[PDB]
Design a protein around this ligand. Sequence first.
Ligand SMILES: Nc1ncnc2c1ncn2[C@@H]1O[C@H](COP(=O)(O)OP(=O)(O)NP(=O)(O)O)[C@@H](O)[C@H]1O
Ligand SMILES: Nc1ncnc2c1ncn2[C@@H]1O[C@H](COP(=O)(O)OP(=O)(O)NP(=O)(O)O)[C@@H](O)[C@H]1O
Ligand SMILES: O=C(C[C@H]1NCCC[C@H]1O)Cn1cnc2c(c1=O)CCCC2
Ligand SMILES: O=C(C[C@H]1NCCC[C@H]1O)Cn1cnc2c(c1=O)CCCC2
Ligand SMILES: [Cl-]
Ligand SMILES: [Mg+2]
Ligand SMILES: [Mg+2]
Ligand SMILES: [Mg+2]
Ligand SMILES: [Mg+2]
Lengths: 476, 469
Amino acid sequence: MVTAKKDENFSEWYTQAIVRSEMIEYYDISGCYIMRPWAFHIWEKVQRFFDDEIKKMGVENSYFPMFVSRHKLEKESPEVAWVTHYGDSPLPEKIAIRPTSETIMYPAYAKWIRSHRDLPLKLNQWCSVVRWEFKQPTPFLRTREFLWQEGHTAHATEEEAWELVLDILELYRRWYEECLAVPVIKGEKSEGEKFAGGKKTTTVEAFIPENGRGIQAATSHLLGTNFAKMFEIEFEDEEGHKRLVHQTSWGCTTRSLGVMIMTHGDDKGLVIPPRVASVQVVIIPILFNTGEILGKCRELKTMLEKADIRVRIDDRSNYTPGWKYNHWEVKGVPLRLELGPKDLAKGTARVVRRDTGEAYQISWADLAPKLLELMEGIQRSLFEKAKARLHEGIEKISTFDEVMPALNRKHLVLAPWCEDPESEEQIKKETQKLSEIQGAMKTLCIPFDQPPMPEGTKCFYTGKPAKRWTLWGRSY
Amino acid sequence: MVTAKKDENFSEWYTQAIVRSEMIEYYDISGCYIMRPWAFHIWEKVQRFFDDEIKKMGVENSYFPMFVSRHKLEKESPEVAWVTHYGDSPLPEKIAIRPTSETIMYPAYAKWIRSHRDLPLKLNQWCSVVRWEFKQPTPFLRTREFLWQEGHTAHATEEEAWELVLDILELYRRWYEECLAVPVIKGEKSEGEKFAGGKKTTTVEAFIPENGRGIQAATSHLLGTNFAKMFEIEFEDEEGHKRLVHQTSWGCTTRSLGVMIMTHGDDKGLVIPPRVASVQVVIIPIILGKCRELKTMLEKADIRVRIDDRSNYTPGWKYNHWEVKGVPLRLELGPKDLAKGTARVVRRDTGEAYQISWADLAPKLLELMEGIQRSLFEKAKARLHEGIEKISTFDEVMPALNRKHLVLAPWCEDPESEEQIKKETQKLSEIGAMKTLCIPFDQPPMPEGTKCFYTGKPAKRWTLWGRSY
Ligand SMILES: Nc1ncnc2c1ncn2[C@@H]1O[C@H](COP(=O)(O)OP(=O)(O)NP(=O)(O)O)[C@@H](O)[C@H]1O
Ligand SMILES: Nc1ncnc2c1ncn2[C@@H]1O[C@H](COP(=O)(O)OP(=O)(O)NP(=O)(O)O)[C@@H](O)[C@H]1O
Ligand SMILES: O=C(C[C@H]1NCCC[C@H]1O)Cn1cnc2c(c1=O)CCCC2
Ligand SMILES: O=C(C[C@H]1NCCC[C@H]1O)Cn1cnc2c(c1=O)CCCC2
Ligand SMILES: [Cl-]
Ligand SMILES: [Mg+2]
Ligand SMILES: [Mg+2]
Ligand SMILES: [Mg+2]
Ligand SMILES: [Mg+2]
């Protein structure tokens, strides 16, 4: 059973919910975690979604090695794990476990690209990534081993690369909004928060109401021509001139599962969106074994599986129905089907939806279509409710004085900002100092969706003219 | 374009082939290779196949960590990679990269398995593995980081575990034989080649005609109860007693790709079985509007098609490129074909050309594709059987090895003998060792007089021997 209350004791709730739901088992190495089926299946669902979508844009998959020579990695960091020996035997030079794959992939890109006919080059990989994170580890959200994909592309023009950046970013919106029912906000990173290797970083950001924190959900970079300068990725154009390629890179990790847990979970435990749940409907026979009820459960299973609904009968002998209800509630199965002798006599079954608790009486013949409609309802309502908590979590302000009260209410702040890089630094400091007295607030993104900006408007901090609205907050 | 000859220098043919098809790029860390799309997509076909099949047996995927603490791994190896630092700082204790995951998975098993209600427990994972191999590395066949799937299961009885050992091994036969059209022999490992932590090790074995080497294609172990005792994987049975569990484990790797390549490849380069080819039919314009219509048509039949309508290459360049890459069928369309209402079609395995009318394409291309696949397999099976010699005594071995053959020979199954045979064969080759590949499930009759071909003692079973990877 789940006992820590979600609003009151968020950290404990989260651990309880991931452990008692059977998603995660703890492990003797810090910041590493076991991903059990109930979590891993969700990762498979989103990997297949995204993979299929990039295969439509002409991206192709590859696998580069997890190892990189120190020489190659330090070409141009305290997080990098170094291998120094195998068995008893010292290596000639230490070797790094990949923390990201630029220094592995880009030298190969310099070899493969010779001519404009080689462009665009579009690759992705799925792989694990290792980083010795300094911060407190958190399962899914921050781990020292995480799973991700990483895309790297090279184009003859900026315009084509930018088109891809945005197309990929829309797929990350989809990953989170369409599969996980988490609402996100597309936006440009500030100068201080963007990938230092690139020209412009775009991002998809999320908000955890229960601790008032923003969190970057995924990232898509327009890298410009600078890696191609560094690594010498050049092409003869059709006029025989030597040109630099234009590059993008993008990634999203097992962090997304965690954001999904935090968003839809409640005091009983998980709530998993139907699109990604391992089991969408659990059949629970009201049994404390004559074979009439399980006979009908099996029948119902077959029937529902014909509509591609994922189903499990919990036919365990030694557990009471109510025990089982709770069990599958902690796991967040979006739908429970109850079948007892009553139900068996009526030709009906009783269905309870995990998001709201609402119960329904449904005739055997209507089950398949009615459970499909219920899952669309559940999926959609999870989203709409989270969207509403997102927009209730953002306070629009005009002045630096509105900042601290807005952070204390566990809110994000949306504010007109001059975008001067020095100012971002000043605001990280000033809100750090002010937080200790009573923690740093930073930029999360400049939203693509800009609320209106009355002609005279001034920066909430410097009072200079204000370019755009920037979304700020405490963050992971 | 490929210039080395497969029957003349095999190593350089292989290198050329996997490089010029754009399957493999070489890398500065020895034993490690870049898998490009053309090779990665074939891995994706066989992974999706096996994955779906183990799902129907109730197996579920997971992901355990790639690190394992010194203490846990060094519990009861020169190949294991050790992490000792983050940035410049050293760790309290060093930490190993997963060479296999018994030591990572089995403590959590001991904790999740309490009763018989919790059995069978069936998990699998896809990951990479790192092993600092001392042998000569070879792309795919033997690499320092390789990709695999490792399956690990726990059962109440040995019967049920064993049942599962064989289901999985049939799935590996299917993986090699149905997807990749590589023929394989199911078998038992001898006591000297079995996984030392298990009871029995079953295997499927493949063969490389051009260097006479056998090669383990995949493996599936009846672990018995010995890991259960060591990790404390006990459960409460029906009667209420504390029973150890019965375990299996099994794995297959990217080595499968290299076996496929070496089996079907020829002097012009790769030949890819239709069942695993990302592109089955490449359409080449030599017009563009009909190419589009034909593609649409062929996809109705689920045929995977690419039109190579890239203007920056000559049609000739395209014939050679898709050839080296092993695309099964190539379809050529000019002005003369356009006005005849037909297409010229060339199959990659035999070079045979067909003239096919637009209406008959989908059914005929489907016919040819089943023929390619059926035929790759069948030639490879005949090539396999021409490579194994039934023998009776030891005096036959060296000549058979020099013909680059395996030998099937009756054996007492004394472990000390296999050891002796290796050294002996080592020494006569110096003047190279031959080991057991497997005891085939398919045993020929053993007449009662018969003697072990080496030691002169009464034989037990027929055993397959040769050099190997
Ligand atoms: N330790 C981690 N565990 C899980 N997901 C992660 C982790 N670090 C980064 N991510 C995700 O991976 C995405 C791209 O990685 P990357 O851009 O390299 O991260 P980053 O910029 O270093 N984020 P941060 O470390 O907070 O500064 C990020 O947007 C995160 O959503
Ligand atoms: N270095 C490697 N690269 C690629 N595939 C491998 C490698 N080593 C083993 N395999 C394959 O993966 C399967 C599972 O590994 P495993 O059986 O534990 O290896 P092994 O017993 O150490 N083989 P070997 O090193 O030849 O004695 C093996 O049976 C091989 O089919
Ligand atoms: O990983 C990236 C860039 C890029 N890699 C591909 C997808 C994600 C995208 O952010 C950023 N990054 C984060 N963290 C680190 C590095 C680093 O480049 C370099 C090694 C030190 C740790
Ligand atoms: O890994 C296995 C057995 C088993 N592991 C699980 C799946 C594959 C199956 O063969 C054998 N093995 C091979 N090589 C090594 C080990 C080892 O156990 C232990 C570490 C040293 C290198
Ligand atoms: Cl330029
Ligand atoms: Mg970081
Ligand atoms: Mg950062
Ligand atoms: Mg080995
Ligand atoms: Mg061995």
